[PDB]
Amino acid sequence: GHMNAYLSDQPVRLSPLRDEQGNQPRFGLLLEPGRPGMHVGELPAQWLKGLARSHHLLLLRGFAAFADAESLTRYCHDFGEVMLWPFGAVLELVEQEGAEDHIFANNYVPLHWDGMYLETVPEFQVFHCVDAPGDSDGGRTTFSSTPAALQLADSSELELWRRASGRYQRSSRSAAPIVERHPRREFPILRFCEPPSEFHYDGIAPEQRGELLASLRRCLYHPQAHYAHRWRSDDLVIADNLTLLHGREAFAHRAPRHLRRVHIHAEPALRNPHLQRD
Amino acid sequence: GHMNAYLSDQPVRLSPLRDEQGNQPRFGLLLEPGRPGMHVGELPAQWLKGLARSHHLLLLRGFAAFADAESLTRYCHDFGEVMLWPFGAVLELVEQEGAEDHIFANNYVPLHWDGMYLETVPEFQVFHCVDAPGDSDGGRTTFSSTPAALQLADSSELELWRRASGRYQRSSRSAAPIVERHPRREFPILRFCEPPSEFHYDGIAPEQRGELLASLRRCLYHPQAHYAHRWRSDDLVIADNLTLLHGREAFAHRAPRHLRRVHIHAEPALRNPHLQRD
Amino acid sequence: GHMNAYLSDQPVRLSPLRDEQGNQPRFGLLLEPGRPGMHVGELPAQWLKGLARSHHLLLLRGFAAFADAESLTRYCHDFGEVMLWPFGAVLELVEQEGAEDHIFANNYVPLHWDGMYLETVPEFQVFHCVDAPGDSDGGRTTFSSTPAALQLADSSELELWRRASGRYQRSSRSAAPIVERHPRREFPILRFCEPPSEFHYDGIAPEQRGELLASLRRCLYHPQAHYAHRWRSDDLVIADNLTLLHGREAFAHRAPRHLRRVHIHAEPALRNPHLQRD
Numbered sequence A, B, C: 001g002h003m004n005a006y007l008s009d010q011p012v013r014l015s016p017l018r019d020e021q022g023n024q025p026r027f028g029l030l031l032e033p034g035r036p037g038m039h040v041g042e043l044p045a046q047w048l049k050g051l052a053r054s055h056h057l058l059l060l061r062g063f064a065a066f067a068d069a070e071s072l073t074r075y076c077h078d079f080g081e082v083m084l085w086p087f088g089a090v091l092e093l094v095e096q097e098g099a100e101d102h103i104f105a106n107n108y109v110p111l112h113w114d115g116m117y118l119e120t121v122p123e124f125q126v127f128h129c130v131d132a133p134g135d136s137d138g139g140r141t142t143f144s145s146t147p148a149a150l151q152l153a154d155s156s157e158l159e160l161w162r163r164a165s166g167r168y169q170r171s172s173r174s175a176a177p178i179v180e181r182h183p184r185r186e187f188p189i190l191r192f193c194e195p196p197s198e199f200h201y202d203g204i205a206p207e208q209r210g211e212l213l214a215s216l217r218r219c220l221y222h223p224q225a226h227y228a229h230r231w232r233s234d235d236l237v238i239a240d241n242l243t244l245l246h247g248r249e250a251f252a253h254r255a256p257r258h259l260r261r262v263h264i265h266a267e268p269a270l271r272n273p274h275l276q277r278d
């Protein structure tokens, strides 16, 4: 059970985002069609961008489909400026039932943000779930609101976070303070790439390393700050990459699913303040 | 009787669009002043554009007037990019009580869209009703939501529509599939110019011509998809030309009325995908 | 007591603006955080601009602070185009408890608008209250909605206002009709610089001068049209400079307060239609 505080002037039903066990984090928003057969394109992109910026995570559920990747691409071009990759606009994320991770690849993704190692950082992730036929076990895409996590820290946790600084390598190198300001809108956020030799933490005594990681995890994975998404066919999800961190829940048996991801630039494009250019 | 689902954060009263016999189609929105003496200009244009894009037809009723055409013009310049004609921004549509259509001109206008034969197609029609003193009989401006009509088609009607293709001539020539995608936002729409020798329909066997026209008319003129507007002095109407088709109800005795119409470009201007340039 | 008509699709609590004695003018809007620890930056600026344009005065109260002037500046750069002064973006308005106005400076500010004597006129004032520790006596920043005042005028007051015209000097000279149209959105507004030899009023017989001033004051200082703001620490106020006039209530004992003001250009920058260039 929960209360419902939103009424839009748009032809949609809004309500708080809740995960499949009824948990309701301190961010996110569910949008559902206000007319039979409504397509996502019928809603004004400018309006979605606004909601995505303040709710940080939008779940549009039960809308009619983009027929293909080209259709999604054209939609995104109208939505904002697409951040192009060598493959174009759409990253295809297709998984088969029970397909092994060639024995070497890990079975979970820790929290991080897109564009860490890029010249420019995208503001939004746009995910279209093409197909998610069966119901899977684990493997949900996870999102955490870094402002929510910041409200959970106690005095000393926070004092520790503020001295801290991450150094990352994958070769490309990137460095960010753990506690950052939103690069356009000023509010306090976290930039943190979570480890599962390539992840160092400066500004603190290296014995406190364990404490930093344990506290950041406690806050970011807390029910107030953390949402795990169970994909459904034709979900359209829009995520605020500048405010959230994202990752993926561990899976034993992975199920069939097909996602498509487009990145949208900040307005105007955001130069990566964290990339090492020296 | 009907229910009222909208509360704005704007100083306006919103409610579902309903025609004068209480019918409530699956689109449209009535906006009314939230303060004594409110002028239409007090509402933010960007916000109206958003509503116009998702509700497709906005009726602003009971707001203070633009004093003249120049005032309307300046307003529209702020609203978006005006699509200029040789006469400028404002088409004057003035009718006198009982004035004959020189004996040759027809007394109704079938459904169609603006910019069929133009190099660029406008996104919005902005109508200001300068004056509509008496109450008339027939002659209402009609609008149809092509997505609504698409939800009404059965399996075979739809199968037929999807093969179909219109060829139009007035000399200028234009061709469009009957079932189209919105040229910016992807969702399914209809492009159809309705006949009352200059209207051919390809992709189907010419004996099915009768069936196409009868089914398209059944769906577009259905109460769920169709709205007929009784003009009142100082109505401001904003119509989504990319999604709707429009026309005019038959009249016996035409009454006095004065309308002004401005066209607003898509963002950016939309090149007519249907004009024959060969 | 009062009724509450707003529900946002944004994570905020909206309600009508009311002064500290419970008066509720015909404009203004109070916005309050929808989440613990919310910062003003979490709300989309484009959305605030829209509300500021239709409600004319926004009071964001109880949000987390900009840490300093630089932070406020960066925020405003994202908000719109900052109108820069020789000092930069932020005017510092710091007052000390009981500090004398060097014996010569007046202890109240009559109603006027920003940019009277400038080449370009800003659309918005953005005020951040850095600190307002004690509770003061008098000295509140005042705002008046000129459309509200226009609804208060009777037939002859209005007839008089419409003939009237202000001529101002501080050297810089500026002239405006008392009754003006909004320079972008057309609706009727007032432009009036209120006197406490440098303020002349044309278009009327100079014996009617007294009547003009008395009627304009009656309407602009009327509870329906007038709001006086008691500053609190971290208030963020956004004012529609194109529609309102502003000033300051008389004070006996002035209290400690620190304000910061940024100006935001119209879109695009507005050339001052009233500056004498001849």
Ligand code: NA
Residues within 6 Å of the ligand: A047, B047, C047
């Ligand atoms: Na809005």
